[PDB]
Amino acid sequence: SMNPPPPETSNPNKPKRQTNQLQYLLRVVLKTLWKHQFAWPFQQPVDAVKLNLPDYYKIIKTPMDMGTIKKRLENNYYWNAQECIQDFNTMFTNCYIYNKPGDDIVLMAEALEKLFLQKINELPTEE
Ligand SMILES: Cc1noc(C)c1-c1ccc2c(c1)[C@H](OCCO)N(C)C(=O)N2
């Protein structure tokens, strides 16, 4: 029923870094997806109470959303690009797992992912 606490977006005991790749992830990748017309359902954790989806957090045990990702990048939560790329993949994967292959939300995720894969194809090599 109730929503779980959201994923953490800072942690005093987790080592922080900024790499040119993480800068690219925030400035080009996140920026491009965030502003997209299909971004809004992904800009914050799935609110399963408000959506009336009691099974969401019985099914999805590794939630992720772009709001969480944006804050992680802003806080320099990550050590490397892979951690961030992983968060995006988890977000898309959760969507494809919970929802049916027809669904608008799935089609939305697919277009965002297609864009994601384009931008990530041009990730710079490290400075
Ligand atoms: C993301 C995600 N992954 O699995 C689910 C379910 C979502 C999701 C999150 C928020 C919303 C919706 C779906 C839903 O559909 C949005 C597209 O119609 N809706 C009507 C809405 O108001 N917000």
Curated annotation (Swiss-Prot):
<comment type="similarity">
    <text>Belongs to the BET family.</text>
</comment>
<feature type="cross-link" description="Glycyl lysine isopeptide (Lys-Gly) (interchain with G-Cter in SUMO2)">
    <location>
        <position position="58"/>
    </location>
</feature>
<comment type="subunit">
    <text>(Microbial infection) Interacts with bovine papillomavirus type 1 regulatory protein E2. This interactions may serve for the tethering of viral genomes to host mitotic chromosomes allowing successful partitioning of the viral genome during cell division.</text>
</comment>
<protein>
    <recommendedName>
        <fullName>Bromodomain-containing protein 4</fullName>
    </recommendedName>
</protein>
<feature type="domain" description="Bromo 1">
    <location>
        <begin position="17"/>
        <end position="123"/>
    </location>
</feature>
<comment type="subunit">
    <text>Interacts with p53/TP53; the interaction is direct. Interacts (via CTD region) with CDK9 and CCNT1, acting as an associated component of P-TEFb complex. Interacts with RELA (when acetylated at 'Lys-310'). Interacts (via NET domain) with NSD3, CHD4, BICRA and ATAD5. The interaction with BICRA bridges BRD4 to the GBAF complex. Interacts (via NET domain) with JMJD6 (via JmjC and N-terminal domains); the interaction is stronger in presence of ssRNA and recruits JMJD6 on distal enhancers. Interacts with NSD3. Interacts with NIPBL.</text>
</comment>
<feature type="site" description="Acetylated histone binding">
    <location>
        <position position="99"/>
    </location>
</feature>
<comment type="function">
    <text>Chromatin reader protein that recognizes and binds acetylated histones and plays a key role in transmission of epigenetic memory across cell divisions and transcription regulation. Remains associated with acetylated chromatin throughout the entire cell cycle and provides epigenetic memory for postmitotic G1 gene transcription by preserving acetylated chromatin status and maintaining high-order chromatin structure. During interphase, plays a key role in regulating the transcription of signal-inducible genes by associating with the P-TEFb complex and recruiting it to promoters.</text>
</comment>
